C-alpha cells in the first residue's frame, strides 16, 4: 500500500543491522496502523495479514539474532493475528512452522506445562500428515520418555528444513537437565556408564560440572555425598508446636463456650 | 443447574441408540452369571479373569507337567 | 477487542513511549474484560509510574488504580486514584468512578475522624486533590443541596466551613437548624 | 374419531390444576411470605424455587398441546392490576377471567402473541409496589415454557425473550442493585437465564457479548456479596472457557480470588468438576484425584447417576496415569456401565501394559473416546504404558535383569533399561538405590510404612488437619442450632 517492502523481504539478509532500520521502520509505519486487530471494513485483512507476515519473518530474524524478549514480543504480537475471531483469515503456510518453533520455545524455556495445556488447539487437522506438524509433540513424547538416544539417532531424520540447528538449541538447552538428572546421584554412579550417557570426548562436562556441581572427583568414579545423611529432630520444637496445638484446641473447643 | 444434564443425556440417548439392546442382552449374557454376585469381587475375578482370558487360564492342569520339566 | 493478547504486555514492557501510550489507551478498553491479564504487568506499570521519566502519571495510575480494586485492596487502588495527580474526569454513572470516589469519600471522612480528635500537634497531611474531588462531587450535590445530606455529610466530614455554605442558600432556615440539631443530638 | 375424540378433553384437565396451584402456591407463598419484611426473611424460597425448577425439569408438559390447548399461553398472572388499593373487585376478576374460558371455548393460538408481553410491564407488572419481585416472579417462570422447544425457529423467539429480559430487568436493572431476597434470587435467576439461552449462544454464536458484559455484571455486585450467584455466573464463564480458552494468565489462579462461601449443595460439585477439568490438563496426581473424586461423591440429591459419568470418566482417565486404576466397584447403575463399555478393554489393558497389541487396541475400536477430541491424554497414555508397567516393576522386585525383566518390559538393551528405570528414578515417587558393583543395578525398594518409622512427625499433621476438620464440623453443629433457636 504505502510502499513495496518486498525487495529486502525475501532477500535473506545475513546482516540484521540493515534489518534493524527496516524493522523499526515498520514499527514507525505500523505505529499508526492499529496493531490491534481491526474488523472494520474487512478489506484491511490485506495489510494486517502482510503485517502479520513481516512480523513473522521479522520474528525469524529475531531468533536468527537470538533475542529472547524480542522473541516473546513478536510471538505475543503474532498470536493476536493468529488468534482472531474471523476465520476468513487464510492460514499461513509458515504458521505451523512458527507455531512449531513456539513449541520449541516452550520446551526451551521449560514452560512445558503451558505447552501441555496448549496441546488442545494444535491438532486442528489442517495438515497432520507433514512430519513437522507431528514433530515437536513427538519430540516431547520422547521427552516424557526422556529417550535422547532416539532423538540423537533422530538428528538426521529431520529433512533439509533449516531448523535442525534450532533443534540443536533445544538439545543444548536440555542437557543441563538430562546431565543434572543423570548426575542426581542418589547412592553413587560410575564413570564408565557416563562415558556413553555423557557426551563426546571433549571433557566439557567434567570441566564445567566441576565448577557447577563442585563435588569430589575420585579415582575414576563419580561420588555422591549429602545423600540421606540428615540427623532426625530433637522432638522438642515439635513438642512446642504441639503445645501450641493444645492451646488452639482449648481455643477452638472453648472460645464462645 | 442440572439442565446441563440434558445435553449429556442427549449424548446418552445417542449412546443407547448406537446399539439397541444388543449390549444389554449380550452383556446380560455375562450379567446372568454376574447378577447378585457382589461386583467388588467381580472386579478381582474380572481382573485375574481378564488377565488369564488371554493365556494360562486354568493352568493348574499344566503344573503337574511343570514338575518334571521345572 | 482482544481477550488473550499478550503483545500488549510486551509493548507495555517496551521503551520509546509513543508506542506505549496508545497501547495503554487500547488497554483501557479491554481492562474490564481482563484485569487479570494485566496482573502480571502490574509491576511494570508501577515502575513506569514511580519514576517521573514517563510523562503521564495518571495514564499509569489510572490503569493501576483500576486493576487493583479488581485484584486486591481498595487502599492500593485508592493511592493511585488519589495519587494520579491532576485527573480530568467528568461525573459518570460507571461503577469504577463511583467506587473510587466512594472509597475516597469513606476514607476521607475516615481521615477526618482520625484528625477530628487531634486538633493540634502531629497533624497528618491530607492531599489537596482529595479535598477537591470530595468537595467537587459534594458541591455537585450542593447545586440544590437535595435538602438533606449537606448537613449530614457536613457533620460526617468533621470540617468547619463545610456547613456555612449550606445554610447560605437554605430554605426554611429554622427547619434547617432544627433538622440540624435533630441530627446532631441523635449521633 | 371416537378413540381420541372421546379421550381428548379428559387427560388434559390435569396439569392445569397442579401448575395453577403451583404458581398460586409459590407466587402467593413468596409474596404472601416475604411481603411485610422481605429483608428480614431471606432465602426461604431459594430451595423452594429451585426444587420447583428441578421438579419441572422432567415435565412431559407439551406433547399434544399445539392443537387447541394453547389458551394457557395468552393468560398470565393478572393479579391486582391497574390500582394498588381497592383490589376486591379484582378478587372477583380472578375467578371471572378463569371462568370466561370455561363456558364454551376460547379463540386460541400459539405463535402470534409473544411480542406484546410488555403491555403490563410498561405501566404495572402486578401492583406498582412490588414490581421487582412480581416482575421476575411473573416473567421468569413462563419464559422457559414458551421458549421450550428451542429448535424450529424459537431461537429467534428466544432472542426476543432475551431482549425482553434485559429490557425490563437485566440491561442494568430497574434499581441497579435491588439488595433484597429478589436481588439474591436475581443472581441465579439471571444466571439460569444465561444458561438457558447459552444453548442458543453456542448453537450458532460463541463468546462475544453478554458473556463479555457478565464480567461487569459480575463485579457490579460491589464485592460485598456472599458471591453464591457470582460464583454461578463464574461457572458459565468457566464452561465457556472449557471448549477453547487454554490461556492461564487470567482464569487459572487469577480468577482464583477469596474463594467465597459458595455452596448451593450443587455448586461445590459442578464448580469443582469444572476447575478439575481445566486442572486435569497438567495431569494433577495428588489434588484433582482426591477432590475430583470428592466432587464425584457430591450431588446425591436428584441423581448420582446421569451426570457423574463425566467426572467419573475423566476421573478414571486421570487415575490410570498413576499406575493404579480402580474400576467401577461400589456403585451399580447401568449408565456409567454403558459409559465404560468401550473403556473396559483398554482400562484393563492398562495394567498388563503390552505395547504393540494395545497400541492397536486403542485406535482399533477407537470411535468415541478418540472422537472425543485431539487424543491428548491417550497420547500421553501411549508412552505412559511402559511407565505404569515399570511402576508395577517397582511394585515387584529390586534387581533388573538384562533378559528376564528387560524382555518382559519388551525393552532389550543394557542402556535403555537403566536409562528409563532412571527416568522413573528422577520422578521421586519411588525408592531405589543406584549401584554398580559388577554392572547390575540394585535398589533397596523399601516400601516400609511409617509404623515404627518417625510416627509422631508423620501423623502429627494428620492429627492437626483431622482435628481441624472434625472441630470445624463441631462449629458446623454449633452454628446451625443457633440458626434453629434464632426464630424462637
UniProtKB/Swiss-Prot annotation, chain A:
Lineage: Eukaryota, Metazoa, Chordata, Craniata, Vertebrata
Annotated protein name in UniProt: 26S proteasome non-ATPase regulatory subunit 8
Cellular component GO terms held in the UniProt record: cytosol; nucleoplasm; nucleus; proteasome accessory complex; proteasome complex; proteasome regulatory particle; proteasome regulatory particle, lid subcomplex
Native organism: Homo sapiens
Claim: Phosphoprotein is one of the keywords in the record: yes
Reported function: Component of the 26S proteasome, a multiprotein complex involved in the ATP-dependent degradation of ubiquitinated proteins. This complex plays a key role in the maintenance of protein homeostasis by removing misfolded or damaged proteins, which could impair cellular functions, and by removing proteins whose functions are no longer required. Therefore, the proteasome participates in numerous cellular processes, including cell cycle progression, apoptosis, or DNA damage repair.
Record flagged with keyword Kinase: no
Residues of the full protein shown: 94 to 350 of 350
GO BP term (any one): proteasome-mediated ubiquitin-dependent protein catabolic process
Domain called PCI: residue spans: 69-238
Similarity field: Belongs to the proteasome subunit S14 family.
In-chain residues carrying the UniProt-annotated modification Phosphoserine: 13
Keywords of this entry: Isopeptide bond, Phosphoprotein, Proteasome, Ubl conjugation
Swiss-Prot record, chain B:
Name of this protein: 26S proteasome complex subunit SEM1
GO cellular component term of the entry, any: protein-containing complex
Task performed by this protein: Component of the 26S proteasome, a multiprotein complex involved in the ATP-dependent degradation of ubiquitinated proteins. This complex plays a key role in the maintenance of protein homeostasis by removing misfolded or damaged proteins, which could impair cellular functions, and by removing proteins whose functions are no longer required. Therefore, the proteasome participates in numerous cellular processes, including cell cycle progression, apoptosis, or DNA damage repair.
One Pfam family named in its UniProt record: DSS1_SEM1
Compartment(s) where it occurs, according to its Swiss-Prot or TrEMBL record: Nucleus
Principal subcellular localization: nucleus
Tissue specificity comment: Expressed in limb bud, craniofacial primordia and skin.
Lineage: Eukaryota, Metazoa, Chordata, Craniata, Vertebrata
Entry keyword set: Nucleus, Proteasome
GO biological process, one term: mRNA export from nucleus
Family in the record: Belongs to the DSS1/SEM1 family.
GN (gene name): SEM1
Domain of life: Eukaryota
From Swiss-Prot, chain C:
Record PTM N-acetylmethionine, positions in chain: 1
Function recorded in the entry: Component of the 26S proteasome, a multiprotein complex involved in the ATP-dependent degradation of ubiquitinated proteins. This complex plays a key role in the maintenance of protein homeostasis by removing misfolded or damaged proteins, which could impair cellular functions, and by removing proteins whose functions are no longer required. Therefore, the proteasome participates in numerous cellular processes, including cell cycle progression, apoptosis, or DNA damage repair.
Source species, domain of life: Eukaryota
Subunit structure: Component of the 19S proteasome regulatory particle complex. The 26S proteasome consists of a 20S core particle (CP) and two 19S regulatory subunits (RP). The regulatory particle is made of a lid composed of 9 subunits, a base containing 6 ATPases and few additional components including PSMD1. Interacts with ADRM1. Interacts with ZFAND1.
Annotated family: Belongs to the proteasome subunit S1 family.
Annotated protein name in UniProt: 26S proteasome non-ATPase regulatory subunit 1
Swiss-Prot record, chain D:
Sample GO molecular function, one term: enzyme regulator activity
Segments forming domain PCI: 269-448
SUPFAM superfamilies reported in the protein's UniProt record: Winged helix' DNA-binding domain
Record GO cellular component, one term: nucleus
Coiled coil spans: none
Glycyl lysine isopeptide (Lys-Gly) (interchain with G-Cter in SUMO2) crosslink residues: 21
Transmembrane segments: none
Residues with PTM Phosphoserine: 401, 413
Pro residues bias spans: 1-15
Cross-link Glycyl lysine isopeptide (Lys-Gly) (interchain with G-Cter in SUMO1): where in chain: 21
Renumbered residue ranges of the record's region Disordered: 1-52
Entry superkingdom: Eukaryota
GO biological process: proteasome-mediated ubiquitin-dependent protein catabolic process; regulation of protein catabolic process; ubiquitin-dependent protein catabolic process
Alphabetized UniProt keyword annotations: Isopeptide bond, Phosphoprotein, Proteasome, Ubl conjugation
InterPro entries the UniProt entry points to: 26S_Psome_reg_C (IPR013586), CSN3 (IPR050756), PCI_dom (IPR000717), TPR-like_helical_dom_sf (IPR011990), WH_DNA-bd_sf (IPR036390)
Entry annotated with the keyword ATP-binding: no
Function text: Component of the 26S proteasome, a multiprotein complex involved in the ATP-dependent degradation of ubiquitinated proteins. This complex plays a key role in the maintenance of protein homeostasis by removing misfolded or damaged proteins, which could impair cellular functions, and by removing proteins whose functions are no longer required. Therefore, the proteasome participates in numerous cellular processes, including cell cycle progression, apoptosis, or DNA damage repair.
Protein family (similarity comment): Belongs to the proteasome subunit S3 family.
Name of the molecule in the record: 26S proteasome non-ATPase regulatory subunit 3
Gene behind this protein: PSMD3
Amino acid at each position: 500500500m504505502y510502499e513495496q517492502l518486498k525487495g529486502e523481504w525475501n532477500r535473506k539478509s545475513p546482516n540484521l543491522s540493515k534489518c534493524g532500520e527496516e524493522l523499526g521502520r515498520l514499527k514507525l509505519v505500523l505505529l499508526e496502523l492499529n496493531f490491534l486487530p481491526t474488523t472494520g471494513t474487512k478489506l484491511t485483512k490485506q495489510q494486517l495479514i502482510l503485517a502479520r507476515d513481516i512480523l513473522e519473518i521479522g520474528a525469524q530474524w529475531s531468533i536468527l539474532r537470538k533475542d529472547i524478549p524480542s522473541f516473546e514480543r513478536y510471538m505475543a504480537q503474532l498470536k493476536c493475528y493468529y488468534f482472531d475471531y474471523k476465520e476468513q483469515l487464510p492460514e499461513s503456510a509458515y504458521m505451523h512452522q512458527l507455531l512449531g518453533l513456539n513449541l520449541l520455545f516452550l520446551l526451551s524455556q521449560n514452560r512445558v506445562a503451558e505447552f501441555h495445556t496448549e496441546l488442545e488447539r494444535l491438532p486442528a487437522k489442517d495438515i497432520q500428515t507433514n512430519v513437522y506438524i507431528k514433530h515437536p509433540v513427538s519430540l516431547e513424547q520422547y521427552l516424557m520418555e526422556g529417550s535422547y538416544n532416539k532423538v540423537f539417532l533422530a538428528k538426521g531424520n529431520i529433512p533439509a528444513e533449516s531448523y535442525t540447528f534450532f533443534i540443536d538449541i533445544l538439545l543444548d538447552t536440555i542437557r543441563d537437565e538430562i546431565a543434572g538428572c543423570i548426575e542426581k546421584a542418589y547412592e553413587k554412579i560410575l564413570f564408565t556408564e557416563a562415558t556413553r550417557i555423557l557426551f563426546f570426548n571433549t571433557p566439557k562436562k567434567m570441566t564445567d560440572y566441576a565448577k557447577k556441581r563442585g563435588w569430589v572427583l575420585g579415582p575414576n568414579n563419580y561420588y555422591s555425598f549429602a545423600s540421606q545423611q540428615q540427623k532426625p529432630e530433637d522432638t522438642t520444637i515439635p513438642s512446642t508446636e504441639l503445645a501450641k496445638q493444645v492451646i488452639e484446641y482449648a481455643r477452638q473447643l472453648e472460645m464462645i463456650v | 443447574m442440572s439442565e446441563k444434564k440434558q445435553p449429556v443425556d442427549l449424548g446418552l440417548l445417542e449412546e443407547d441408540d448406537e446399539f439397541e439392546e444388543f449390549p444389554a442382552e449380550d452383556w446380560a449374557g455375562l450379567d446372568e452369571d454376574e447378577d447378585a454376585h457382589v461386583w467388588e469381587d467381580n472386579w478381582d475375578d474380572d481382573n485375574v479373569e481378564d488377565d488369564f482370558s488371554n493365556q494360562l487360564r486354568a493352568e493348574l492342569e499344566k503344573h503337574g507337567y511343570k514338575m518334571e520339566t521345572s | 477487542m482482544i481477550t488473550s493478547a499478550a503483545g500488549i504486555i510486551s509493548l507495555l514492557d517496551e521503551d520509546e513511549p509513543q508506542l506505549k501510550e496508545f497501547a495503554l489507551h487500547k488497554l483501557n478498553a479491554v481492562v474490564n474484560d481482563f484485569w487479570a491479564e494485566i496482573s502480571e504487568s502490574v509491576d511494570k506499570i508501577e515502575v513506569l509510574y514511580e519514576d517521573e521519566g514517563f510523562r503521564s502519571r495518571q495514564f499509569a495510575a489510572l490503569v493501576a488504580s483500576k486493576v487493583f480494586y479488581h485484584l486486591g485492596a481498595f487502599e492500593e487502588s485508592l493511592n493511585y486514584a488519589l495519587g494520579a495527580g491532576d485527573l480530568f474526569n467528568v461525573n459518570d454513572n460507571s461503577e469504577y468512578v463511583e467506587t473510587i470516589i466512594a472509597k475516597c469519600i469513606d476514607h476521607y471522612t475516615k481521615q477526618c475522624v482520625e484528625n477530628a480528635d487531634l486538633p493540634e500537634g502531629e497533624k497528618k497531611p491530607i492531599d489537596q486533590r482529595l479535598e477537591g474531588i470530595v468537595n467537587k462531587m459534594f458541591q455537585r450535590c450542593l447545586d440544590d443541596h437535595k435538602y438533606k445530606q449537606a448537613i449530614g455529610i457536613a457533620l460526617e466530614t468533621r470540617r468547619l466551613d463545610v456547613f456555612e455554605k449550606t445554610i447560605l442558600e437554605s430554605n426554611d432556615v429554622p427547619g434547617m437548624l432544627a433538622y440540624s440539631l435533630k441530627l446532631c443530638m441523635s449521633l | 374419531p371416537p378413540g381420541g375424540g372421546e379421550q381428548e378433553p379428559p387427560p388434559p384437565p390435569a396439569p392445569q390444576d397442579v401448575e395453577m396451584k403451583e404458581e398460586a402456591a409459590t407466587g402467593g407463598g413468596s409474596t404472601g411470605e416475604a411481603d411485610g419484611k422481605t429483608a428480614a426473611a431471606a432465602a426461604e424460597h431459594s430451595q423452594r424455587e429451585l426444587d420447583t425448577v428441578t421438579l419441572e425439569d422432567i415435565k412431559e408438559h407439551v406433547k399434544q398441546l399445539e392443537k387447541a390447548v394453547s389458551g394457557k399461553e395468552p393468560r398470565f398472572v393478572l393479579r391486582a392490576l391497574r390500582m394498588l388499593p381497592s383490589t376486591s373487585r379484582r378478587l372477583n376478576h380472578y375467578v371471572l377471567y378463569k371462568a370466561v374460558q370455561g363456558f364454551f371455548t376460547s379463540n386460541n393460538a400459539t405463535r402470534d402473541f409473544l411480542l406484546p408481553f410488555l403491555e403490563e410491564p410498561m405501566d404495572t407488572e402486578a401492583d406498582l409496589q412490588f414490581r421487582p419481585r412480581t416482575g421476575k416472579a411473573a416473567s421468569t417462570p413462563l419464559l422457559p415454557e414458551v421458549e421450550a422447544y428451542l429448535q424450529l425457529l424459537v431461537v429467534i423467539f428466544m432472542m426476543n425473550s432475551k431482549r425482553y429480559k434485559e429490557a425490563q430487568k437485566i440491561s442494568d436493572d430497574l434499581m441497579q442493585k435491588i439488595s433484597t431476597q429478589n436481588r439474591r434470587a436475581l443472581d441465579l435467576v439471571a444466571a439460569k437465564c444465561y444458561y438457558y439461552h447459552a444453548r442458543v449462544y453456542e448453537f450458532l454464536d460463541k463468546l462475544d457479548v453478554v458473556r463479555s458484559f457478565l464480567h461487569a455484571r459480575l463485579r457490579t455486585a460491589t464485592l460485598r456479596h456472599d458471591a453464591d450467584g457470582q460464583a454461578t455466573l463464574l461457572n458459565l464463564l468457566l464452561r465457556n472457557y472449557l471448549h477453547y480458552s487454554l490461556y492461564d494468565q487470567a482464569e487459572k489462579l487469577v480468577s482464583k480470588s477469596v474463594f467465597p462461601e459458595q455452596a448451593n449443595n450443587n455448586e461445590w460439585a459442578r464448580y469443582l468438576y469444572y476447575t478439575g477439568r481445566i486442572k486435569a490438563i497438567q495431569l494433577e496426581y495428588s489434588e484433582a484425584r482426591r477432590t475430583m473424586t470428592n466432587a464425584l461423591r457430591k450431588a446425591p440429591q436428584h441423581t448420582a447417576v446421569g451426570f457423574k459419568q463425566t467426572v467419573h470418566k475423566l476421573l478414571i482417565v486421570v487415575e490410570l496415569l498413576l499406575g493404579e486404576i480402580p474400576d467401577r466397584l461400589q456403585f451399580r447403575q447401568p449408565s456409567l456401565k454403558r459409559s465404560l463399555m468401550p473403556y473396559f478393554l483398554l482400562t484393563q489393558a492398562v495394567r498388563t501394559g503390552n505395547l504393540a497389541k494395545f497400541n492397536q487396541v486403542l485406535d482399533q475400536f477407537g470411535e468415541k473416546f478418540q472422537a472425543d477430541g485431539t487424543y491428548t491424554l491417550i497420547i500421553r497414555l501411549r508412552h505412559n504404558v511402559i511407565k505404569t508397567g515399570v511402576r508395577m516393576i517397582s511394585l515387584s522386585y529390586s534387581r533388573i535383569s538384562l533378559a528376564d525383566i528387560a524382555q518382559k518390559l519388551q525393552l532389550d538393551s543394557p542402556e535403555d533399561a537403566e536409562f528409563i528405570v532412571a527416568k522413573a528414578i528422577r520422578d521421586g515417587v519411588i525408592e531405589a538405590s543406584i549401584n554398580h558393583e559388577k554392572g547390575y543395578v540394585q535398589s533397596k525398594e523399601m516400601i516400609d510404612i511409617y509404623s515404627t518409622r518417625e510416627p509422631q512427625l508423620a501423623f502429627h499433621q494428620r492429627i492437626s488437619f483431622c482435628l481441624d476438620i472434625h472441630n470445624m464440623s463441631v462449629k458446623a453443629m454449633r452454628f446451625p442450632p443457633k440458626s434453629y433457636n434464632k426464630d424462637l
